[PDB]
């Protein structure tokens, strides 16, 4: 009872050689986008936290390498914290991967 109530779905996976994400900007449009309305027709997706929304007001000397990196405009940009070279183990407690 105690072990199940605490750590029922907790697992730890371990590589053989540490290998992080090589790419900087993810290009994948399998699911819709918010558009401009606050309450979009589609439910709030988990990829919209990385969305590169189109901006209107920017200085003349603005560049696309300041914060969006090499990713194409309107694509999804991920931070460096998810691709550390020293990441060797992964821990997760969820049940969205069962058979």
């Amino acid at each position: 009872r105690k072990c199940y109530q605490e750590f029922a779905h907790c697992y730890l996976v371990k590589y053989k050689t540490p290998q992080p994400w090589p790419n900087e900007g993810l290009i994948a449009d399998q699911c819709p986008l918010p558009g401009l309305a606050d309450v979009s027709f589609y439910p709030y997706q988990a990829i919209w936290d990385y969305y590169a929304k189109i901006e209107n007001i920017r200085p003349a000397n603005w560049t696309s390498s300041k914060l969006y990196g090499k990713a194409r405009m309107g694509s999804y940009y991920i931070p460096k914290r998810l691709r550390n070279i020293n990441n060797t183990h992964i821990l997760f407690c969820s049940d969205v991967l069962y058979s």
């Binding site: 072990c3 371990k14 558009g35 988990a46 007001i57 183990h89 821990l91």
Partner: protein
């Protein structure tokens, strides 16, 4: 792991997927151009997006503004949106209308991993040690980064650890 999962639980696909199968629908990629969409691979409906593309090429990154103030200035995207809509690729994924699409492969990870279950360790190590001590130490191990994994939502609960010790030593 299915294709759609990458935008429902992005962290697990980013941290666990071995092959990067990116889905390209924009114009320019995979050797598809506006002047050869018909002759390259739908041969010949009832939908405006049949054999149609999503993101078009209008030019390059340019900034033009001569307004009174220099702060609020107009901007030109380098990959223009001819419709500014949001439900093109999602409907294209359901195979309802034809159109260009290209899947690209990129290997990142090999060397098949090893999986350990924390619950099994909790069950097995509790037959020889005080179960309260085991529970406390395992909870401390789960809080290695200072953020409890159980606290973070079920959908997106994935953390990376730099050579943690498993299992930790327990007090006498």
């Amino acid at each position: 792991i299915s294709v759609l999962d990458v935008c429902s639980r992005p962290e697990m696909v980013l941290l666990l997927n071995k092959t990067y199968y990116t889905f390209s629908l924009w114009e320019g990629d995979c050797n598809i151009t506006r002047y050869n969409v018909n002759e390259t691979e739908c041969k010949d409906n009832d939908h405006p997006y049949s054999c149609r593309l999503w993101r078009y090429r209008e030019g390059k990154e340019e900034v033009k503004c001569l307004t009174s103030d220099h702060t609020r200035c107009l901007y030109y995207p380098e990959y223009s949106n001819p419709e500014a809509l949001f439900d093109f690729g999602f409907l294209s994924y359901m195979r309802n209308f034809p159109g260009p699409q290209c899947i690209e492969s990129t290997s990142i990870r090999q060397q098949d991993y090893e999986v350990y279950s924390i619950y099994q360790e909790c069950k097995l190590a509790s037959k020889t040690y005080g179960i309260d001590s085991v529970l406390f130490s395992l909870k401390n191990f789960l809080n290695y980064t200072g953020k409890p994994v159980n606290e973070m939502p079920n959908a997106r609960a994935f953390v990376g650890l730099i050579d943690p010790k498993f299992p930790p030593t327990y007090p006498n």
